Amino acid sequence: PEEVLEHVFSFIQLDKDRNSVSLVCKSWYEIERWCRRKVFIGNCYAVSPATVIRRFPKVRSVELKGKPHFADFNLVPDGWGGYVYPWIEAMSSSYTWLEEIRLKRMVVTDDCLELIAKSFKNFKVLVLSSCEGFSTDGLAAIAATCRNLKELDLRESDVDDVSGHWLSHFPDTYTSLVSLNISCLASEVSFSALERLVTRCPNLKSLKLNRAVPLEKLATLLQRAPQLEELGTGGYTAEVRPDVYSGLSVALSGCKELRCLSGFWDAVPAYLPAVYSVCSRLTTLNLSYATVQSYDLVKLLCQCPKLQRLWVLDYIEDAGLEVLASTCKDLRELRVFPSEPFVMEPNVALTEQGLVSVSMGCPKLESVLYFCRQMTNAALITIARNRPNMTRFRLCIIEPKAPDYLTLEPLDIGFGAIVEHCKDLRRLSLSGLLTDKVFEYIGTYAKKMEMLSVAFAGDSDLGMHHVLSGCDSLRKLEIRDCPFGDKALLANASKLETMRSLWMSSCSVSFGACKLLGQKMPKLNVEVIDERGAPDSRPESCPVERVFIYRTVAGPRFDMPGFVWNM
Template sequence: MGSDPLMTAQTPAPWPVKRAASFPCCVLSPRLFLSRSVKRVGAASTDDKALPCVCCVCRERGLSQYPPTAAACTTITPAAHFPPHDDGLAHFGSTLARPTRDSCADTPSMTAEHAKLARVRQANTARSRRPQRDASTSRSDSSASTSPERGYDDEDKDSVMLQSNDSLSSLAPSVSPDSDDEARRRAIEEQNRISPVSRLPAELIIAVFAKLSSPADLKNCMLVSKTWAGNSVGLLWHRPSTNKWPNVKSVIQTVQTANTFFDYSSLIKRLNLAALGAEVSDGTLKPLSSCKRVERLTLTNCTKLTDLSLEAMLEHNRYILALDVTNVESITDRSMLALAKHAVRLQGLNITNCKKITDDSLEAVAKNCRHLKRLKLNGCSQLSDRSIIAFARNCRYILEIDLHDCKNLDDASITTLITEGPNLRELRLAHCSKITDQAFLRLPAEATYDCLRILDLTGCDQLQDSGVQKIVYAAPRLRNLVLAKCRNITDRAVMAITRLGKNLHYIHLGHCSRITDVGVAQLVKLCNRIRYIDLACCTALTDASVMQLAALPKLKRIGLVKCAAITDRSILALAKPKQIGSSGPIAPSVLERVHLSYCTNLSLAGIHALLNNCPRLTHLSLTGVQAFLRSDLLAFCREAPPEFNDHQRDVFCVFSGVGVQRLRVFMNTNGGEDVDNEEDPFSLNDGTMYHEDEDGDNMVVVTAQANTMAIDEEDEFGNDSEMAGQD
């Protein structure tokens, strides 16, 4: 063991042995000793036998040994042993020189004489300690904690416990181990007096309470303690129930009550009055303007509301994130200007059918509410390109925008929305009748918009093949594409759509009567992950197309309304079990919804097979199918909508939910006499799609024609893209 400056000082004579009550801190509290000594000495093991005793008295008396033993320390009275400071052994000496709250909690009270001797001791050794330390060339393991290399000079300067004068130890008040144990026991009891659940942090308690779905459970939690009440009341009032008038009155009365234990008006974050609709008036909303932390305000169909109450609500609330005033036609620019001024954090706005809101106020909203992500302007036919371009250029975080039936919009606003919206994910332009191919052909030639997933162009009847080709090239990751009632598109546009490949899940081509079996065959071949396809009123399609569609392994919904050329052969193909992969097992069809209204060539046998081989079927539309206009079968049909006329009611035949199940049972028992004797058209072990070879040959010819058209289409589209680039 190396020399220690502390060891060079005079060592006082040992005190009388008191084995019954003479244990140093290391022996009295082994756990405390181990935790401190590992940190101080740097030992790699916490084994008692591998660690020296580094308590203050043992170090001073030169008793730092391996291992520490009670015999080595029994010559030291416990009066000199003060429990270590919470900051570590570096503060052993400063515990007495500079008593702190922690040290005072763990050590006996220091007498006045004790403090005086400490100051004298520090003054006598201050000048001699530095030379001694500089002269020392080696350190033992027990003295390493005071060496300059360990970086504890600052602590040693104030240390009085590390000096050679033993007067402090000899005159210190005696402390009994029993009193230490008693104090420790009382501290543990005080800590355990509080329930462990009550010591959980507020964030964890709130996370647990958030799992409770019943308001009654949250109310019971509030009765446990003030802590639980404070953590559960926010969840209970976060979104108060306002679907009935008594609930609304109770909420209004509570937020208007003064001197409540909780500030309920600041707890409400979501306020939804849509369930009351037209019953809500300005007198209902105005008292709620005291709720100044509302984040989502839903006023759908509250047609009696005016700017008077909504403007007051917005002026007192700067935390609005989403506002929905669908069908509140009395709302004008006043409310929108108040929204633009106060709701700078706005992320969602729905003003569907608000006819009195103009471009002026929406332009202000676009310039001030730059965090907008979702925007619904359905039916606002008074809007022009000016407000839409303002949103595109100022709100760069827009994810979804719905411009359904905004008939005044031109190509310029659509082009700007796509080019200026790097995060645009959903674009709905249904019935924007002024949109032409130029809205997409003006896009930069090499630009791609990978975020765009949903594009709805329903009723854009000026759109042609070239526009579809361009948008498919520009947005290669489109998942949902709606081209219903785009009557000018042909198989050439369908060939372009096949470039989407496995990304395409939803395709709507209803009323595109110029599409033929050739385009459908190629679509099925290259886009084999289609889940929903609607080909209603595509009158040129035959059984060949439906047989191809039946091969789609994930097809859940198919619409073939008024495809009058299809027969039972198509229905049997849809019902046929599918083979999973090229060599996988045979599995039943996963079809869920089938629309076959006005397919007049269908018979009872085909539908019976469809019911028995599609276990997931929940919706079957057979309106106008003569074979099903029987009273015994119509008994399972759902009611016709009230707006239907007499003729529509007579031919209405739609089965859904439980009605499909009951129809299946009925046809398998009582109602299927005319089909029970027919031979089963296929079995679960039969994975082929066609019954006769000539059908397969016909589809090979159709596929060859589709490939030829695809090659021609690629060449022609290349010329189109070059022209677009020059523009």
Template sequence: MPWEIAQITTKIHLHDLPEALLQQIFSFIEPTRARNSASLVCRRWRDLERRTRSSLSLRGNPFTIPYPPSPFPSFPSLSSLDLSNLSPWGCPLSNTPLLVGPTLPDKFPGVNSLKLYSRDPTALISLTHHWPKLKRVKLVRWHNRPSGAGITIGSDLHPLFENCGEIEEIDLNEFYCWTEDVTEAIRSYPLVAKGLTGLDLMLANATDGFRASELVSISEVCPNLQRLVAPCVFNPRYMDFVNDETLRKLATNCPHLTTLHLVDPTPINLNNNPGAVNNLPEDNPSAITPACLETLFSSLPLTDFSLDLSHPILEVGPALEALGQRRAGPLVKNLKLGYFQGVCIGKWLHLDGVAVCGGLESLCLKNCADLSDASLSAIARGCTRLSRFDLIGCDLVTELGIQQLAIGLRQTLKDLSVSRCPLISAPALVKVLKPVRRWLERLHLDCIWTGSKAENGGAEHDLLDDNNLNGLCEPQSKRRRYEYEEDLEGFGATGTVNGGCSQWPESWECLRELSLWLPAGEFLFPLRDIGFEDCPILSSITIKVEGNCRAKPDPRTFGLSILSHFRELSKMKLDLGEAIGYAFTAPFGQMDLSLWERFYLHGIGDLFLQELDYWPPQDREVNQRSLSLPATGLIQMCFRLRKLFIHGTAHEHFMRFFLQMPNLRDVQLREDYYPAPENDMSTEMRDESCGRFELALNSRLVLD
């Protein structure tokens, strides 16, 4: 009898399930590659997959996309469509009437969220006619706007407002245009602007921000805004700068704002001047005052607030306390403060400033000159829900403050970033993060790689593993010291405070993303030696190199081979864009950029990478940032690579080396670089050569 039952059950197939149940099962499949594989099983599975897909990203050249014969199964449930990678070399979609005309609207009738690479207004003009009910639109353009007779102020956005009357959210975070383009387009269509609830106006490569009059004008025609992200001019030396009165008008015109990000895009390089924050003159404060901030916090239901300035705001503690103690409205969850002074004093057991905001889940403190280790200890005691913490350019913070923060937030902290803090070294920072190793998922280290020295005599700080916590508890009261010792013992420390902490976890069980900063010419530090010997699921790493290579000695290898023991590492971002060298000819005894690229990329073929973002080094004197022959040959050795994004220029005969990579499916030139125009005397890739490379890339047979 059991054998007969088993024989009967083996004849049951997945296709025997009812159509509605099988369709429900397919709707639970989220990974894109899993869906693509399922659609290749049979025609029925292909139809089910397309009927249940909600988002889709199209890649490749629109001239070479094969069009199946009619009838072609449509995607009735598709609501989000990404066309930003469909034309990576800048071919206007208006030149492909078969794709833009009847094909896209017929196959994707329910699209309400669109991401589009818009080289000129013709792409929006062609598409918005077919999708007049778009709700969310994100435009992408990394390069300068093209010049032509039809390109006027606001013309890039006019088709969107003219044809899509129900638009709610616009994202221009990766779109290169001018602030007057946005202001003119929004003001020209007040009825459409009245329905907008979200505006991300950060604008790619923005060096200037919105003036006070422009920001107020946008808020007047968009009274229902709930999310606003914009770069602004806060410098009092400029005319029409954003001040207290501007923020008050913004709060009055848009009373429903829950997310407000205002950023000063003025670049400030602190890596070459670590004391730049503390050396700011006190008579050059920001035009924003704490009293205005307190009014802003009481007027708006803010849950996500960011104010990143280039001039300091003094004594902001009481305003932040008012934000954390307000009774009306929801609790603030995300906070980013740039150049705020007096954020948290952390004196004794009293909680002040930002430490009062107990509902915070994400906190970023940037260029806070008076932030200390005691401040971090108070934040850890007051903000017990923090899962993300970013610390940038704080001169007084040491590893001991990070250690107190890690112990206090060991159950919640998952994302930590420490950048440009001169008293913190990367090896020592990794050492004090033992309390949160088991839970951290993302870690960014932008610190010096030598031993961290204190100002008093140059002695190193006593760390947790040194079995000496007297230095950590010294600035605190006796009561707080005893509480700290009990906290350590409760977490697993053996014995008293001087008895060591052998029970701290050694494995980074959840670490998926690691980001490192290194000075130019230095070697990649052996990560195993500083505590990264056990990272079982590390899948993404970012390495940024910054500095002048011209005065550095002749190196041998950078050290990428030491990453080969991370077996799950599949994605890398190698940013050499801020590494400066000689592009063509170098003086006697110096190396040109091609040799530096060989130095940095040597050993990349030993890794198990599937995706690579690469920024070549540059020579600013000749405005040169191009892929060299040694770099091309070394990248070609990554046989498992599937996606390659080069943020720079390249030559066609160098790019053809990549055609020999068996698994490579997607290659793009990105950022502010663009195929050279036909009248350019350089030999870099142009539109026609890019098209030839794309055709050769897509005509290859890739097994997976």
């Protein structure tokens, strides 16, 4: 009976499993759609709001993603798109019971936030990840009105910081906060309102402060929330005083469930030790903002045996990474960011050896993002052989086209070893000197790769061809500054219907190829993004600044600015 099938489905919540059940027969299709609780829309222009709402009438959680990843490198001009308002407007009428909206790289305005606050009485979760377009006034509308709000998470968003007064709009009757991430906000929130908020929210488990909360006020907040599981500090600087340090130490030690620490802006080495009571059970440490030196980092890391995720500046150095490799046997993810990315000569002793050390020492290491100035094929081969379980490998050599510094060869064979030996590698970002041969290796071996990012690499269209011809699992390809043009794109046009998207900027793709691709593939949006005026004002052979291609069931979008043309 229908009621049993719906109950069987209640235990099936994976998107892919949902889609699979929807295709077994027409009856399962109907029962499935009427009880689907969440939708994940990885490209907001792949489908229209109306299509979503009419298929899945009883959705309570929506996740939407807008601009592609290279937006992070400012390669998507302002005004390109990713407007969420059309989605909020459509849902406002139909999804009365909506509880969660999670957005990434979307343009979200105060009008959006006001309409959310007003339309969705049961609204509980707002995650704005790398979004832009709104201000603390929109935030004030959410705080004033969303009586049931549990999560307000603004991670990496660009907010118009009009005033910190917004937070004082949460009323005295509001007690339901579970997660608050305001780390992106420059404006100072009322500290008294913040302390009152934390005090009255007994289920608060994640509190990620902004920089404007000074270190001398931190212990105060921690005393009010001893149940915290995640803490992002505010500022981490003060005059060095025994009373301040002792108050901080005690407050942190009273947080027995703390597992994740971040923030640390302007961190003073004298005050880092106050977190040591936490260290023993910490599983995530984000020291990205702390410009503290290797030895101080090492003293902290020495006593984090349970660490699973570390983000750290290259100040860790090869010596700090050797320590990490012996101490943190459960490490799963390491990200090492550049302290001085605009200086060509090394300012720290961080090289390929640091990454080699961690590859040898941490048997569960499977996700790497590593910025460095030098690399060898030998090191990459050692890494691949040591870690055949690697699933995400992103290596960012600061100098474009830097060869192996010992042999002066391209890094083709080293990355070749990565894709050959790491059979479940799903994400790869390439850098260093690379020829078409690395792409041949990728095509042959990277059969599980879903996301590939390429910059300043390859020799000819043959490189891009090997990737489109060979990479069976490819979902996202993004390319900048490579000698790839018309031939591989057009020869592999049908492959594009199997991918979320393809991005190519500062490559050799002609306007004429984009026009022809658009003609051939009507179910693709082929968007030429060019700030030099109408492309038909230059010869058809002239390369476009950018092209962004994506499959869609919605057809050409209605919100293109003047510098975007759909073919």
